[PDB]
């Protein structure tokens, strides 16, 4: 493969052996904001592998719950992401 | 509401049957995999593209299941046992022990 | 009730929103794996030892999950997609299509 | 080692069974299980060579009573009558 070279902050998605809320990866750091099943909104962050990253960083636009994911690719860059919920839709669909 | 990880599990042979067909050991640490595969699958979950795609589809169509938390690396242990002729035999057993887990 | 097998899933890029970064193909047959892993695990489920051992442990201790039904071989598909500066490139995405399932 | 043994199957058939038979390199089995009313039920099929010895050996006090018997002969399994412990 291609070796991990990137260091990201993590919160919620930390590996189980994470040291001081950081993680390493050959992919991208991310931050994500979303409503859970109760409409509670939460902010979590971490590392994404290189393989599959096009799909996850782009997201699908209309999932069951509102979310927004953002990715960046420089050391600890996800401490600066401030992603925001998509505007809400009115009317059935 | 806790993610895919490996979890401890000791399998005691006497305690499940094979007390008397397996001379050695009496048990072994097997571990097992369990936990959520959320969107996004993080790096340490070693997901395949298929699983990443499936997670996104499940988020838009809930009739399609999420990925499952399963062993992604297993190792062997050898055992001493008596067989169908009943000779005492040493044998390597493949994929006995969970070394790590991922969302597949 | 119905046990671990492969199932059809077609993933249409424009229904999921990806058709403005994926120029070709418009979608593809991804399939997925789902279904029971009962005891005993019959041959065509290609369980590993570990999944077998764990299926037995689950019949004595229900606190420990059944083996799960997941892809056991995967194939690749190639795509035309945009890059950063709006260049279309071609690449071979590994592990996109499920070719077979098993209890793991 | 290729598959070489032919077994009957019922409840545990692969989607491509030929006249309710499967083909394997392990063993034919049959097995009788007992539900919650005691109204029991009898199934059979093919067991892979790998881990066959784990699945053929008989283990007491599960959630249920069941018994399984294996063998390795053409249709050995179509008239195997396991009896509950």
From Swiss-Prot, chains B, C:
Location in the cell: Secreted
Record text on subunit structure and interactions: Homodimer; disulfide-linked. Interacts with SOSTDC1. Interacts with GREM2, RGMA, RGMB and RGMC. Interacts with ASPN. Interacts with MAFP5. Interacts with FBN1 (via N-terminal domain) and FBN2. Interacts with type I receptor BMPR1A. Interacts with type II receptor BMPR2. Interacts with SCUBE3. Interacts with TNFAIP6 (primarily via Link domain); this interaction is inhibited by hyaluronan. Interacts with ERFE. Interacts with BMPR1A/ALK3; the interaction may induce HAMP expression.
GO molecular-function terms, A-Z: BMP receptor binding; co-receptor binding; cytokine activity; growth factor activity; phosphatase activator activity; protein serine/threonine kinase activator activity; signaling receptor binding
Keywords noted in UniProt: Chondrogenesis, Cleavage on pair of basic residues, Cytokine, Developmental protein, Differentiation, Disease variant, Disulfide bond, Dwarfism, Glycoprotein, Growth factor, Osteogenesis, Pharmaceutical, Phosphoprotein, Secreted, Signal
One BP term from GO: negative regulation of cortisol biosynthetic process
Glycosylation sites: 46
Disulfide bridge positions per record: 4-69, 33-101, 37-103
The keyword Protein biosynthesis is assigned to this record: no
Disease tied to this protein: Brachydactyly A2: A form of brachydactyly. Brachydactyly defines a group of inherited malformations characterized by shortening of the digits due to abnormal development of the phalanges and/or the metacarpals. In brachydactyly type A2 shortening of the middle phalanges is confined to the index finger and the second toe, all other digits being more or less normal. Because of a rhomboid or triangular shape of the affected middle phalanx, the end of the second finger usually deviates radially. Short stature, facial dysmorphism, and skeletal anomalies with or without cardiac anomalies 1: An autosomal dominant disorder characterized by short stature, facial dysmorphism, skeletal anomalies, and variable cardiac defects. Distinctive facial features include midface retrusion, short upturned nose, long philtrum, high-arched or cleft palate, and variable degrees of micrognathia and dental crowding. Skeletal anomalies include patterning defects of the axial skeleton, characterized by 11 pairs of ribs and brachydactyly of the fifth ray.
UniProt record similarity statement: Belongs to the TGF-beta family.
Natural source organism: Homo sapiens
Tissue specificity of this protein: Particularly abundant in lung, spleen and colon and in low but significant levels in heart, brain, placenta, liver, skeletal muscle, kidney, pancreas, prostate, ovary and small intestine.
Gene Ontology CC annotations of this record: BMP receptor complex; cell surface; cilium; enzyme activator complex; extracellular region; extracellular space; intracellular membrane-bounded organelle; plasma membrane
The protein, known as: Bone morphogenetic protein 2
Gene that this sequence comes from: BMP2
Curated annotation (Swiss-Prot), chain D:
Tissues in which the UniProt entry reports expression: Highly expressed in skeletal muscle.
Documented effect of changing residue 4 to Y: In a renal clear cell carcinoma sample; somatic mutation
PTM per Swiss-Prot/TrEMBL: Glycosylated.
Cell compartments where the protein resides: Cell membrane; Cell surface
Cysteines paired by S-S bonds: 7-28, 9-13, 22-46, 56-70, 71-76
Annotated region described as Mediates specificity for BMP ligand, given as residue ranges: 53-55
Domain of life: Eukaryota
Residues the record marks as carrying a glycan: 19
Illness association: Juvenile polyposis syndrome: Autosomal dominant gastrointestinal hamartomatous polyposis syndrome in which patients are at risk for developing gastrointestinal cancers. The lesions are typified by a smooth histological appearance, predominant stroma, cystic spaces and lack of a smooth muscle core. Multiple juvenile polyps usually occur in a number of Mendelian disorders. Sometimes, these polyps occur without associated features as in JPS; here, polyps tend to occur in the large bowel and are associated with an increased risk of colon and other gastrointestinal cancers.
Function text: On ligand binding, forms a receptor complex consisting of two type II and two type I transmembrane serine/threonine kinases. Type II receptors phosphorylate and activate type I receptors which autophosphorylate, then bind and activate SMAD transcriptional regulators. Receptor for BMP2, BMP4, GDF5 and GDF6. Positively regulates chondrocyte differentiation through GDF5 interaction. Mediates induction of adipogenesis by GDF6. May promote the expression of HAMP, potentially via its interaction with BMP2.
UniProt subunit comment: Interacts with low affinity with GDF5; positively regulates chondrocyte differentiation. Interacts with BMP4. Interacts with SCUBE3. Interacts with TSC22D1/TSC-22. Interacts with BMP2; the interaction may induce HAMP expression. Interacts with BMP6. Interacts with heterodimers composed of BMP2 and BMP6 in vitro; the interaction may induce HAMP expression. Interacts with TGFBR3.
Family: Belongs to the protein kinase superfamily. TKL Ser/Thr protein kinase family. TGFB receptor subfamily.
Protein name: Bone morphogenetic protein receptor type-1A
Organism name: Homo sapiens
Complete-protein stretch covered: 55 to 139 of 532
């Amino acid at each position: 493969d291609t070796l991990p070279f990137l260091k990201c902050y993590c919160s919620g998605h930390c590996p189980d052996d994470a040291i001081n809320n950081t993680c390493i990866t050959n992919g991208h750091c991310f931050a994500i904001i979303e409503e859970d099943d109760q409409g509670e909104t939460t902010l979590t962050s971490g590392c994404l592998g290189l393989e599959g990253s096009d799909f996850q960083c782009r997201d699908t636009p209309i999932p069951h719950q509102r979310r927004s994911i953002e990715c960046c690719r420089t050391n600890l860059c996800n401490q600066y992401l401030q992603p925001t919920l998509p505007p809400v839709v009115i009317g059935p669909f | 509401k806790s993610s895919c990880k490996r979890h401890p599990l000791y399998v005691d042979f006497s305690d499940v049957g094979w007390n008397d067909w397996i001379v050695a050991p009496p048990g072994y640490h097997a571990f097992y995999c369990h936990g959520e595969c959320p969107f996004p699958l993080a790096d340490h979950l070693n997901s395949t593209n298929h699983a990443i795609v499936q997670t996104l589809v499940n988020s838009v169509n809930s009739k399609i299941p999420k990925a499952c938390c399963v062993p992604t690396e297993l190792s062997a242990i050898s055992m001493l046992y008596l067989d169908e002729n009943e000779k005492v035999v040493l044998k390597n057993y493949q994929d006995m022990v969970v070394e790590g887990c991922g969302c597949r």
